[PDB]
């Protein structure tokens, strides 16, 4: 190509959007923004495919141009805006609040939250650097840059940001025994407690996590997001607490639910 | 046009390779900026990304640094004496990085005489002008004279630099790239490097 690409084939779209094959040739290409193309959820997909508010792409635009949708407290009229992990979506017309959290299957879930909880979010510290005049700067996973952070905050930590002022309230350090969620890989969407960290100089580090039921797994250090201190999360969790079931016990649960239905 | 690609080259084994695409814009090259000595003439070049490169075609002044004294001053450029890469560059008086040039000594002499309050570059005949006399022989108080006399303890310069100051021209080396940034900056040669380049210049003659 001679420059940036502007389209996205429907079969080449991320598979956690759960698009069907026969609807069209194209998929909504996410706009540039805080989150990556392969790790976001476009506003149109959430607004018509998940919530069933709109039937076509035109109705999504008609909803958005009435300034009804807010993302992290700010009105977004773009229908392909990239919304990502730990983002807050507010609809004041219906008085609804949602937080984008992966379910145990690695897909963004429709997770309703209290309006009190919708005032803050958690962010992962990606970079720490000193700028001009010796002023510290902290860069999070969602492209936020914050000046004068707490001197004890380092990389791979978690900070709580108040969405109205955009300022740090408190933080969680990356230590063994804390609660974390996996944000990528084969264990995406799982929740557990950090057991130990393996350091490989010049390469990727590996972190071992164990869930509430006692199942153990491992990921890379870049795929770990610290949620809470100890066993207590600082956010509300979806229907599944982050425990991944096997296919046999999913079948057993489904059969038990069917038997008790009716 | 001028292409600086790698696929027109032979392989490591020695066999030649057939290209699979034509010349691309991002592989281009441009004619050299042969910077001479004369009244300033600089042309700007629009480069990749929309940025600018300053293509110096003629230069006559630049700021050079006396490292031992940490004295940086803006001085005119007089002549080109040595060039490690090629001697044709000396004959045509081309200003490139790492070439040895001759610069004027007056601002450095002024700073030295205003700092240590000692003669420098003066003939043994002791002819003087009243401005220089009041610069060197000014009436100072006890405290200021105490500082100047203490400074006179460290006032000592090698014979090579002293002879160059007597000649009125210093030897300097250019550290910037005139064809890329549009300015000719450098440092004054001194120490073992000065002896090395003096030996090279003498052997060239």
């Amino acid at each position: 190509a001679r420059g940036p690409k502007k389209h996205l084939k429907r079969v080449a779209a991320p598979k956690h959007w759960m698009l069907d094959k026969l609807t069209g040739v194209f998929a909504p290409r996410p706009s540039t923004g805080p989150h990556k193309l392969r790790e976001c959820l476009p506003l149109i997909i959430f607004l018509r495919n998940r919530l069933k508010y709109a039937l076509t792409g035109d109705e999504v635009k008609k909803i958005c141009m009435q300034r009804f949708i807010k993302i992290d407290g700010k009105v977004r009229t773009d229908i392909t805006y990239p919304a990502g992990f730990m983002d807050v979506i507010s609809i004041d017309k219906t008085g609804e609040n949602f937080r984008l959290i992966y379910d145990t299957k690695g897909r963004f879930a429709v997770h309703r939250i209290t309006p009190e909880e919708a005032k803050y979010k958690l962010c992962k510290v990606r970079k720490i650097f000193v700028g001009t005049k010796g002023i510290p700067h902290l860069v999070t996973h969602d492209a936020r840059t914050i000046r004068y952070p707490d001197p004890l905050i380092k990389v791979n930590d978690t900070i709580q940001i108040d969405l109205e002022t955009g300022k740090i309230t408190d933080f969680i350090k990356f230590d063994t025994g804390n609660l974390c969620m996996v944000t990528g890989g084969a264990n995406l969407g799982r929740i557990g407690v950090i057991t130990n960290r393996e350091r490989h100089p010049g390469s990727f580090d590996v972190v071992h996590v164990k869930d509430a039921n006692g199942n153990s797994f491992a990921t890379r250090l870049s795929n770990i997001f610290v949620i809470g201190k100890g066993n207590k999360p600082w956010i509300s969790l979806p229907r599944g607490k982050g425990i991944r079931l096997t296919i046999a016990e999913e079948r057993d649960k489904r059969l038990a639910a069917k038997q008790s239905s009716g | 046009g001028i292409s600086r690609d790698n696929w027109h080259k032979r392989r490591k084994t020695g066999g030649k390779r057939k290209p699979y695409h034509k010349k691309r814009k991002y592989e281009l090259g441009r004619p050299a900026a042969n910077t001479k000595i004369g009244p300033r003439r600089i042309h700007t070049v629009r480069v990749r990304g929309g940025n600018k490169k300053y293509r110096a075609l003629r230069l006559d002044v630049g700021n050079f640094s006396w490292g031992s004294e940490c004295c940086t001053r803006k001085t005119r450029i007089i002549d080109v004496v040595y060039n490690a890469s090629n001697n044709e560059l000396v004959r045509t008086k081309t200003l490139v990085k790492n070439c040895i040039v001759l610069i004027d000594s007056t601002p450095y002499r002024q700073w030295y005489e205003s700092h240590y309050a000692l003669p420098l570059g003066r003939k043994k005949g002791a002819k003087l002008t009243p401005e220089e006399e009041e610069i060197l022989n000014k009436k100072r108080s006890k405290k200021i004279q105490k500082k100047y006399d203490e400074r006179k303890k460290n006032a000592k310069i090698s014979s090579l630099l002293e002879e160059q100051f007597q000649q009125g021209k210093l030897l300097a080396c250019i550290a910037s790239r005139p064809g890329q940034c549009g300015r000719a900056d450098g440092y004054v040669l001194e120490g073992k490097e000065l002896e090395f380049y003096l030996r090279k210049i003498k052997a060239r003659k």
Partner: protein
């Protein structure tokens, strides 16, 4: 003297050797402070690099290079270029149809720093990846271990 063999003056760019001093400190010793660095990954700096006087901008310890990427090993086969040698890497390639292997080799031209001396043909060398230093050189010698016949 022995170092100065080119038309241009050979200097370590990060060391200022023209600092003026008193006449008492000049008499003592004209010993330039050496510039060296730790390359990381557990490799130690040879004493010949710290105490040496050679000038090499492509040396991993006293030059302007960065070691990042793959760490490989080879056997020295040719030492005939200036500050660069040719090593041979041997391996086996698996052929699925016959369930067997075939012997294959590759040749690498790598940069050898002057800090490594007494390097002979047939000894093991550990090299690290860096930016392209020339048309065919992308690796720098990090460690030298002698052959089994060392006495």
């Amino acid at each position: 003297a022995d170092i100065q063999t080119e038309r241009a003056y050979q200097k370590q760019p990060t060391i200022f050797q023209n600092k003026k001093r008193v006449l008492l400190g000049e008499t003592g010793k004209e010993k330039l402070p050496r510039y060296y660095k730790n390359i990381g990954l557990g490799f130690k700096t040879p004493k010949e690099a710290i105490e040496g006087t050679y000038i090499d901008k492509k040396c991993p310890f006293t030059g302007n290079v960065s070691i990042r990427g793959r760490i490989l090993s080879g056997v020295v086969t040719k030492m005939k270029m200036q500050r660069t040698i040719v090593i041979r890497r041997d391996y086996l390639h698996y052929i699925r149809k016959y369930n067997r292997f075939e012997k294959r080799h590759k040749n690498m031209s790598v940069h050898l720093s002057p800090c490594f001396r007494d390097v002979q043909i047939g000894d093991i060398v550990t090299v690290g990846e860096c930016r392209p230093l020339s048309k065919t050189v992308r690796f720098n010698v990090l460690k030298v271990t002698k052959a089994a016949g060392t006495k």
